[PDB]
Write a protein that binds this ligand. Structure first.
Ligand SMILES: OC[C@H]1O[C@@H](n2cnc3cc(Cl)c(Cl)cc32)[C@H](O)[C@@H]1O
Ligand SMILES: OC[C@H]1O[C@@H](n2cnc3cc(Cl)c(Cl)cc32)[C@H](O)[C@@H]1O
Ligand SMILES: [Cl-]
Ligand SMILES: [Cl-]
Ligand SMILES: [Cl-]
Ligand SMILES: [Cl-]
Ligand SMILES: [Cl-]
Ligand SMILES: [Cl-]
Ligand SMILES: [Cl-]
Ligand SMILES: [Cl-]
Ligand SMILES: [Cl-]
Ligand SMILES: [Cl-]
Ligand SMILES: [Cl-]
Ligand SMILES: [Cl-]
Ligand SMILES: [Cl-]
Ligand SMILES: [Cl-]
Length: 333
């Protein structure tokens, strides 16, 4: 007997109701732009599959950000491009303005609207209670949008949120691991950075959905309000689940496992053993008390659930009391 089927509780069929060409990215064809219209100004950074630069469009002197892709599975290139095009005009999602070829390698170079070169991780351990709420809400706007457009981000982490703190503007970036959701489809669990991976990934449950992003989001919130980086500090994939189990307790883990009839190695269960739930209030210390409210803990508790189907949706999260006042922000710069 295999694992129990799952479908998203929200936006289940959004891709089903759209034309094939919306999501069948394997049959997309790229309309290239003129590389010569852009000139790189300076290097912002280099990562795994990319180098990112500041650049200018010399036709109108508009400053842009240019991400030059390093060689990857060509199917994945089409995937990211199609996703970014689909999402253009979404709230707090990076805007793909053009696509050009690298003069040297002829690899694709993605041209984006300009954004300031500061990521959330650089700021997020020193925000006020108010600003955590504010920026959490802005991230939710992005996630609800991309989920509503049938897209899982699958790499929600501090390093993937760019912030312009001066102008209170935030963009969700790094859509290279994003994927279209299709009910019934089994997905690769090698997504998301360790500290942000949901229990579904860690127990090899493949029929997951947008709710993975909500787990990652919860991991970000816990980090911010408790001033702990990362909140769940696993040393390997197995220990990531152990760390989660030492906070949420094993009782609910084995209930989740039993619910979806998941294939858990008894030798992993021996190491998991039994751990008591560690009430969310246990991670409060004098350092972080001014950040931890009953509404914060209620919210966190409702995001950080083993069972992906119990997790708040992005819309449900946006309606949570944690954001009750911050939605009234008066946009002071
Ligand atoms: O004069 C040669 C011009 O080629 C631009 N250039 C070099 N490598 C590039 C890679 C990319 Cl993705 C782009 Cl858009 C422009 C590049 C340089 O930025 C320079 O302005
Ligand atoms: O290696 C870390 C450095 O790389 C920059 N970076 C990585 N991916 C990026 C994507 C965008 Cl859109 C921007 Cl603006 C910067 C990026 C980060 O902003 C940081 O300056
Ligand atoms: Cl597909
Ligand atoms: Cl295109
Ligand atoms: Cl990160
Ligand atoms: Cl990006
Ligand atoms: Cl996949
Ligand atoms: Cl993948
Ligand atoms: Cl993995
Ligand atoms: Cl931990
Ligand atoms: Cl137990
Ligand atoms: Cl406790
Ligand atoms: Cl309080
Ligand atoms: Cl749970
Ligand atoms: Cl959602
Ligand atoms: Cl709720």
């Amino acid at each position: 007997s295999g694992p129990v089927p799952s479908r998203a509780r929200v936006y289940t069929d959004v891709n089903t109701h759209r034309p094939r060409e919306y999501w069948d990215y394997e049959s997309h064809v790229v309309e290239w732009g003129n590389q010569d219209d852009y000139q790189l100004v300076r290097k912002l950074g280099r990562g795994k599959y990319s180098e990112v630069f500041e650049a200018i469009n010399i036709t109108n002197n508009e400053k842009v950000v240019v991400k030059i892709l390093k060689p990857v599975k060509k199917k994945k290139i089409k995937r990211e491009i199609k996703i970014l095009e689909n999402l253009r005009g979404g709230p707090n999602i990076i805007t793909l303005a053009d696509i050009v070829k690298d003069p040297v390698s002829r690899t694709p170079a993605l041209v984006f609207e300009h954004v300031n070169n500061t990521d959330f991780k650089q700021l997020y351990q020193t925000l006020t209670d108010y600003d955590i709420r504010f920026y959490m809400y802005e991230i939710l706007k992005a996630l609800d949008y991309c989920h509503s457009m049938g897209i899982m981000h699958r790499d929600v982490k501090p390093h993937n949120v760019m912030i312009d703190h001066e102008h209170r503007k935030l963009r969700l970036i790094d859509w290279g691991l994003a994927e279209f959701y299709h009910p019934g489809q089994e997905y690769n669990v090698r997504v998301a950075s360790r500290y942000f991976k949901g229990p579904e990934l860690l127990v090899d449950y493949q029929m997951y959905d947008y709710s993975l992003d909500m787990w990652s989001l919860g991991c970000m919130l816990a980090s911010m309000i408790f001033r702990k980086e990362p909140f769940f500090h696993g040393h390997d994939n197995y220990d990531q689940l152990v760390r989660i189990a030492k906070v949420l307790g094993t009782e609910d883990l084995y209930d989740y496992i039993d619910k979806y009839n998941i294939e858990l190695d008894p030798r992993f269960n021996d190491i998991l053993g039994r751990h008591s739930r560690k009430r969310w209030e246990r991670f409060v210390h004098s350092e972080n008390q001014h950040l931890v409210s009953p509404e914060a803990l209620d919210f966190l508790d409702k995001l950080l659930r083993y069972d992906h189907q119990s997790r708040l949706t992005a819309r449900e999260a946006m309606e949570h009391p944690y954001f009750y006042t911050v939605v009234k922000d008066q946009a002071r710069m």
